[PDB]
Structure formats: structure tokens, C-alpha cells
Amino acid sequence: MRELARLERPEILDQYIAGQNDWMEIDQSAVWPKLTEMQGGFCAYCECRLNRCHIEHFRPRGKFPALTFIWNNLFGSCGDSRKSGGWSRCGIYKDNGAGAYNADDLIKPDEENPDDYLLFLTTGEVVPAIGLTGRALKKAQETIRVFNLNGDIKLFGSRRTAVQAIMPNVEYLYTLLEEFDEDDWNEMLRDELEKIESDEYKTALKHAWT
Amino acid sequence: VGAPSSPVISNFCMYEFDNRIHAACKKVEITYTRYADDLTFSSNIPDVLKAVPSTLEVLLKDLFGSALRLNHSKTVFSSKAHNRHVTGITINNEETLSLGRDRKRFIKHLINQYKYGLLDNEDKAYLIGLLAFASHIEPSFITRMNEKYSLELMERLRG
Amino acid sequence: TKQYERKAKGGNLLSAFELYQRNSGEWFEMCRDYIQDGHVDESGIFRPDNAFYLRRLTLKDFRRFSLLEIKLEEDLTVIIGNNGKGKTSILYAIAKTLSWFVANILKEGGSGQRLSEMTDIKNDAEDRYSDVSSTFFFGKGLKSVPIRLSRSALGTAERRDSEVKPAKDLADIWRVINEVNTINLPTFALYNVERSQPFNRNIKDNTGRREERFDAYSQTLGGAGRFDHFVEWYIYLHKRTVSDISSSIKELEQQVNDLQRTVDGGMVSVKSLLEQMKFKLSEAIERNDAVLTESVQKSIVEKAICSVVPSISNIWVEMITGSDLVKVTNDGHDVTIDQLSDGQRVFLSLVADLARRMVMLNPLLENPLEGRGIVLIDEIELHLHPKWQQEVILNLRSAFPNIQFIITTHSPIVLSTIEKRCIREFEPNDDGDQSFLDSPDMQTKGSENAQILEQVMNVHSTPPGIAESHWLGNFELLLLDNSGELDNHSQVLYDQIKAHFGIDSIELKKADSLIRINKMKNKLNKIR
RNA sequence: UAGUCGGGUGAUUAGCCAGACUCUAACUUAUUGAACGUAUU
Ligand SMILES: Nc1ncnc2c1ncn2[C@@H]1O[C@H](COP(=O)(O)OP(=O)(O)O)[C@@H](O)[C@H]1O
Ligand SMILES: [Mg+2]
Ligand SMILES: [Zn+2]
């Protein structure tokens, strides 16, 4: 997961008020293009390419009905309740499959940098970052557990495979550091790091390259 | 079904059913109508009609227990990808009521036969009856037939 | 009636048949043409104008299913899921439905099979009854043939009725039209896990005649086939072919010609044998000279078997020992059927049985294996080595191009040969309340097996319960904890990986790669 | 690709031409009764 930059707030959230209005009422096609600007057409938590996608309340509408029509609270997550059943990570699992959790002990990707908490191994596990204790460890652990970032075999598989595809190219660049002057080699690495913004699982590919 | 009172009684017995389901559908922007035992639901929103069958089963059980049940074999989903009809009337892709291509072609066939004096009296009577129905559902079709076949021929037929 | 006449002239088969029955020429010919008309496509395969297949299946309170709907493909549908997801239940439901067509093709008002009141009703269903509803298609003139099989649980005082009249109506058309003038008939077969059995040639079934056409329907939906019936039928065909004198003359003429060539090539030792065969040929010609359909039937089946079953290149009957033996050339060696491996025998049995039935039921086709039908196969990969699993669906579909196959499998290797549109997958945590089955998201045809394992079958490509499966991950984490340098702990694990997987292993190469990359990354960091 | 919709042609339920559509997804139905259309009055 990525550090997201939440920039501008859409007009429609002003109109609807919590208590009176329900989430079934609000029009969703107004909300999406601002999220798609933020998130780049990728999921908030896992970084798949969004195709079946829903608006997710980071703090849910049951436990926090005050935090409902709040631009901070909304994120575009992979999965859909409507089109098919039994989705097993991210938004849908946080509610259904991840049972009890304190929402305070989760990484919120708009507020925080995830990179200090999470580490992506090239073998395709996501793990807590090197040298965390107490609360910083507990956030890393619970984020991994609640969004099901290792436990979804479909996701674990896809990420592992995506990284293992590029590991010849990583290996090969860091041989050529010997031969070239700095500014050409630094341009080469800048380029590869430019491409992976178009790619799925961009954080995991970054950790492989950098 | 054969008794003159049965239509009235059956509609009455479905009154509460109709109230509840109509109200429920209206909240989610689904159009609902009932023609005797035939229930029709339509919407412009994708992925809302899938929930309706489950809702129906619950409501039927609530109101009638096990006495009235859905025919699960007769539950059919359709869209503008496919043929759509409601009580024998085709809804075309321009959102207009139609007899359907095959029926129109058949009527044209019969008119052509009449033009050459090949229709027997029984078939003629049949054709006349069908044209009255066509006039009610698709008046534009009659106009087209007048254009295709001479108003004189068609007037002669309908006289 | 005038109404039926209008519908019949519009191409409605049932109306045409009703008019035929009431008047009993025009209408008969309409019905017969509807069934027999077709054309040969660009690939040289016969295609019926009016196809027959199962369109849709609905299960209500049946075994594990509360209410389930399946849409089937006209050609191939593969059902996948874990053990206990109800894959076999689906095939059983279909097979019972098909039994009503078979019963009524054999006998007017014949009875098909029934749902079990002991086992088939869902255990916790509040309504104590079950329904299996099917819809079949038979061309544009008969777009919908609905059947329902129903059963109430054993105690229950209300009894729920089946609705089978449409099945009977369609089967009546096949039976009656066939009686007046021969038509090709549909094949219905179920091959479940019961098809694995020991072979005994010694046991012969003396119930009915194996050469009689409608014997093709005998135990067709019983699950095992009747491989014994095949062997009996094949020996029968052989005896008739050998007894036909002109083919014997042609065969003898060919043998004499082959022997004459050998004698002309300098082998004087076979001259005595040539003279004997020439005498036999002359005698055969002298005996009153007159192509056996039996000869063609035999050839068709032999070709089918050899084409579909990879290890078998030839099949024939020998009588010279004094008992009739079917022999096969298996992997270049001539063996008896009894000597085949269980995997080979079971697969041979399936194909042989299917081919026999199609030959018997499609006498008017140039290639009888291009006939119509619905064939159900449970666990297609049963006893098959991975190598064979890569061929099996392709071979079957090539040999039987107009059959609707409905298959179950646990094999990713099989799935790698099939399009995603043909696949129906259970949701991972189903609990028997899912309303509609769907296809996987990933394209399976041409994909790597390891990807199908993970993306379609929800199984790790490396066994998570083995510690060694995690060593590379642990190794990487140790390397990253010590700023990319091999410390004592990382070196120990490296040595363990080397010791366990070997010097040439993928795993060790990955470890080496990690070392190289991390060393270089650290050097860059120091320069900065 | 396929299926669907159907404006036109066509001694016409066919065939051919033109244009269009695509929630995993139509399968054209039943009278003498009831209602509706037309005729009759
Ligand atoms: N009458 C029944 N009520 C409830 N569950 C049943 C009933 N009959 C069978 N089952 C369940 O259905 C499953 C049978 O799976 P089966 O049809 O053999 O599928 P598969 O071949 O995929 O294992 C088991 O989980 C069994 O417990
Ligand atoms: Mg009337
Ligand atoms: Zn996600």
C-alpha cells in the first residue's frame, strides 16, 4: 500500500447530512472521479487494478454513523457485494471475515506513510518493517491481518508472480553500476521507477528495485 | 379460473401482496406490475433485480404460508441483449411496443395471399381479427401496411 | 386444426407432429426433415440444423443446495470445486432427468428414475421436499423442453409431483418417426467413478441381444458403461466380417499378393505357404461369390479407440487359441485387455462404450461419431498420469464433435486445456446458499498449471505445511535485518538451503541472487 | 464472433439487404370465463 495525497473534496457530500440521509440514497458516480484521481485506478489497501470496485468506509457505518459522509473516511477498495459473493480481502473482509478489530490500530493510507510500517519481501510475503516495537508493531500486524494481505492466496500469488517477473531486470541493473558514470545509472533507475506507477502492486515493485 | 367471480377474488387476495412489493420496489427504482399469476419487474439500474426473487419468496411465505409459491422454473432474467416481452407484447430496443418481427412477417404473408385471392374465408376472418389487435398495439404497423399494400386493398380487406 | 397448421408452417415441430398423429405425408416429412437435416461445415464435420442440449438446471432443497441455478454451454461445461461442494450431485440430478428421455424412446409411457426420499432432500430444509428442474433445447422449432423431478421426504403427508410430460412428448416424436422411417437417435450416457472396476472376460450377460439397435440404451445412465457388452459386440462384429466371403476373398487376395511379393524377393521358404493360400483363394472364389456395414462399424470403432486412447495403436480379435480374445497393441507390445493397467483399461472402457453406442444409434451418418447427445463424466482425470491429462479433453472433443460434455475435475492440468467460459466454479466459502455458479476471472486455456492452482483452485504452489518451503523467505528477512551482509545466522540458513535443495537448485540460485542484489544495493547506499 | 432487435425487399411464416443492441441471463403462452381491441346493434 501507498502513501495517498487527498487533495480536493467533492460538492455532493455538502448536500447529504448524517442521521437524516442513508448511504443507499447518495449518487456514487459523482464521488468516483476524485478517488480515481487520488488512487490512480488501483486499490487503496492491496494495489490491484480496480475492475470490480466499491466505496469503502475506513471506519464502518455501523460502529461510526457520525463518520459517514466525510471525505477523509472514503476509499476505493477492490471487490463488490453486488456482482458476486465471497470476496476475501480488503474492504469486504475487514467487515465480514476479519472479526473483531480496533480501527485505531490500522494504517490509514491518506494520513500515514505505510512504508515505515510495512516491508514487502521479494518472495511475496508482506511483513512488519525491520525494528518495530509496541504500537508500531501492533499497527503493522493488524493491518496485515485485517486487510488479509498475506492470507488471500489470489493476492499472495499475484504479487509474488509480479515481483519474480522483474527480478532478472533488478539483478541486471545493479551489475551495470560498476561500468557507468553516476548520472546515467541514476537516470536508468529513475526511468524504471517511473514505469512502475502504471503497474499493479507498485509498492512491492519499488522495494524490489530500490 | 372459469368462474366469473374468480378474477375479482384473485385480485383481492393479492391486494396486500401487491401493496408490499410495489412499495419495496419503488424504493430501489424497480417498476412492478402483475397480470394475474404473471409478475413483471423492470429497472435501468444494473444488479438490483437479482434480489427480487428472494424477497418474493419471503413475502409469499409471510402472507400465504405454503399455499402460494413461486414457480422457480418460470423465473427469467432478460435485457436489451436479448428478447424481451411482457404478456405477449414485444418491447423492441427503441423502447417501443411491437408485435415482433415474426408476427409482422406472418401478417404480411396473409395480406399478400389476400391480394391474390388465395385466403379462404376462415383465414380472412382470422387476418381481420389480428389486424384489429395490431392496430391497438402497434398502429404505425397498419400505416406501413397501407403504404406497402395500397390503402384501397387494406380498406377492401377491413370492409 | 387451423391453429396447428399455422404454427407447423412456421416451423414448430410439436404442432407438425400433432397434425401427423391426427391425420394418421407433408407433416411426416416436416418432422423427419427437422430431425435429419444438417450440413457439412468448412472443417468437414456434419452439423445438425437443429441442435439438442441442456440449457439450464435449477436445484431446490436438493442435497446440500437450498436453491442453485446453472447455465450450461452447448459444447463443454466443466464443474470445479473442493470435495463435498456437490459436483457429483449436479451430474446425478442431470442423469436422472435424462433417464426420462431414454425410457420413453424405448417404450411408450416408459418410466424414468426418481429422486431418493431417503437421501436426496436437503437435511435441514424446512419444506421437506426437493425439486430438480431442467430445460432442454431442440432447435428453433422447440426452444424449450422443461422437466421437473420432485420428491417429498419419507414421513411427509403432502406429496410433491414430478412434471415429465414434455420429456415424454419429445421422446415420442423420436420413437414414432423412427418406427416409420429410420432416423439417427440421441446418445445419453453417464460415466461416474463406478466406471473403475476389475475386468472379467469370463462373465457374459445373457439378457437381450447385443446386435439389436436399442441395446445401445441398455444401462446407459448406470454410471459404469457396459464394457462387457462392448467386448461381446466387438467379437460378434469380427465373426460376421470373417464369415463374409468377399472380404475374406479380398483379405485372402491381399495375403496372396503379399506372399507372392516375398517369394519374388528371394524367400523360397514361404513358397509352400503361398501355394496353400492360392488354393484357399481359388476355393473361396469357386464358392458362390456375391461392403458389410458390420465391417465399416468395426473400422469406425477401432479408429476412435486408437485416436483417443494414447497408449493404444491397434485393437483386434484372436480366436486361434480356441477362445475369443480381444488384443491391443499397447506401447508397441501386443497384450490382452486383462493385462492393461487400470488407468488404460478404465479410459479404454469409457471410449469404447461411447463409440459403440454412437455407431448403433447413428446408422445414417457417414461418420456416426458426429451424432447428437449429452455425455456426463465425473472426475475425468481418474487414474490418468499428468501427461495424459494434457490430452484427454482435446481428444474427446475431436472424436465426438456434436456431443454436449458435462464434466467434473480436480486437475489444474485438465483446466489448462479449457477456455474460462466453459468453467463453473463454486465460491470458496459457499455453505450451499449460492444462487448462480460463475466462471473464473483468469483465462485458463494455455496458462501455467501453477497459476491455475493459485488463481482458480485456491491452493499454494508450494506446500505451506513444510518448513523448508519458508527458508527462502526467512533467508531474505535475515539478509535485510543485517544491512544486506551475510551474518552468522544468514550463512547457516544459506548452508541449510544449499544442503537441502542442492547446488543447482532454483532455491539456491534465488538465494545467490538475493545476496548479489543486496550487496550491490548496500554499496550504492554507502556511496550516497 | 455470437445471439438479439427490426426498417426494407421478397406470390411473402422462407431467403436476401440495411441499420442497431449487449445487467453471467426470454423459453410467445389459454376458453365458451374475465378484461381489452374490432365488428355487429
Ligand atoms: N441430503 C443432504 N443434505 C445435506 N447435505 C447433503 C445431503 N446429501 C449430501 N450432502 C452433502 O453434500 C456433499 C456431497 O458432495 P458430492 O455431491 O459428492 O460432491 P463432490 O463430488 O464435489 O464432493 C457432502 O458435503 C455431503 O455432506
Ligand atoms: Mg373469445
Ligand atoms: Zn484491495
Short mmCIF file of C-alpha atoms and ligand atoms in Angstrom, two decimals, chain A residues 42-50 52 54 76-79 87 89-92 147 149 152 155 201, ligand 3:
data_model
loop_
_atom_site.label_atom_id
_atom_site.label_comp_id
_atom_site.label_asym_id
_atom_site.label_seq_id
_atom_site.Cartn_x
_atom_site.Cartn_y
_atom_site.Cartn_z
CA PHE A 42 -5.67 1.00 -8.06
CA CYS A 43 -6.99 -0.37 -4.76
CA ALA A 44 -6.33 1.58 -1.53
CA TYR A 45 -5.03 -1.39 0.50
CA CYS A 46 -3.76 -4.20 -1.82
CA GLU A 47 -2.96 -2.16 -5.02
CA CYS A 48 -4.71 -4.43 -7.53
CA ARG A 49 -6.13 -2.89 -10.71
CA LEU A 50 -9.73 -1.92 -9.86
CA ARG A 52 -14.95 -4.81 -9.52
CA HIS A 54 -16.76 -0.32 -4.20
CA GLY A 76 -11.93 2.98 -3.36
CA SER A 77 -11.48 -0.73 -2.46
CA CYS A 78 -11.37 -3.86 -4.66
CA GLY A 79 -14.35 -6.25 -4.54
CA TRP A 87 -14.59 -11.74 -1.65
CA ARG A 89 -9.56 -9.33 1.34
CA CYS A 90 -9.59 -5.52 1.75
CA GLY A 91 -12.95 -3.69 2.36
CA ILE A 92 -15.17 -6.80 2.23
CA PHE A 147 -6.98 -6.50 5.14
CA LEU A 149 -2.73 -9.06 2.65
CA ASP A 152 -5.66 -14.17 0.29
CA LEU A 155 -3.38 -11.79 -3.80
CA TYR A 201 1.42 -3.84 -6.73
ZN ZN E 3 -7.85 -4.44 -2.38
#
